[PDB]
Design a protein around this ligand. Structure first.
Ligand code: SF4
Length: 191
């Protein structure tokens, strides 16, 4: 009747046509997401940076390159999971997306998660965090590492955004993130 591929494409087409928030006026290309539509684990960030915007792909910038390594160091191949963000359009001067802008785009993420139906989601960053606590304010630093019960029994593991490890290069910091990723993997349901 219908395939996951087709539904994601519909999401994709509606995004390219979206003008729901101010961010549509700035971006060069929308960044929907990429990966395995059958992964049991999804990674979600904040939004498009300069490279993402140019390639229309997620996490291709320096932060993305770093994320690739964290995944590799967690026994994970990019091609095996799915990667996306809370907002699809790049804000001017890469400023942080406004909560309003965040609220307007969210329905897309929801559909994506709906289509993939994963066992666990990793929230990279505070923005990714807000989305899973209903926009509410929460300190990424205080909650990182603690599993959150989300819809359909799915678990969300919040952790730091790769962008942070670009800034602070301490090994302790990298170890914590990896620890959090391992944590999420433990929630993937055994075969
Ligand atoms: S950021 Fe999202 S809600 Fe705003 S114009 Fe882009 S696709 Fe639409």
């Amino acid at each position: 009747m219908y395939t996951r591929e087709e539904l994601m494409e519909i999401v994709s087409e509606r995004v390219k046509k979206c003008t729901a928030c101010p961010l549509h006026l700035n971006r060069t290309n929308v960044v929907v997401g990429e990966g395995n539509l059958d992964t049991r684990i999804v990674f979600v960030g904040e939004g498009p940076g300069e490279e993402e915007d140019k390639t229309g792909r997620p996490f291709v910038g320096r932060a993305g390159m770093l994320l690739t390594e964290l995944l590799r160091e967690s026994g994970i191949r990019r091609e095996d999971v799915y990667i996306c963000n809370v907002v699809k359009c790049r804000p001017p001067n890469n400023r942080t997306p406004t909560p309003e802008e965040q609220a307007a785009c969210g329905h897309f993420l929801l559909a994506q998660i709906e289509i993939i139906n994963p066992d666990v989601i990793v929230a990279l960053g505070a923005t990714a965090l807000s989305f899973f606590v209903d926009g509410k304010k929460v300190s990424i630093t205080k909650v990182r590492g603690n599993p959150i019960d989300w819809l359909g029994g799915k678990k969300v593991i919040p952790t730091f955004h790769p962008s942070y490890l670009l800034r602070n290069r301490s090994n302790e910091l990298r170890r914590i993130v990896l620890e959090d990723i391992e944590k999420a993997k433990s929630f993937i349901k055994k075969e």
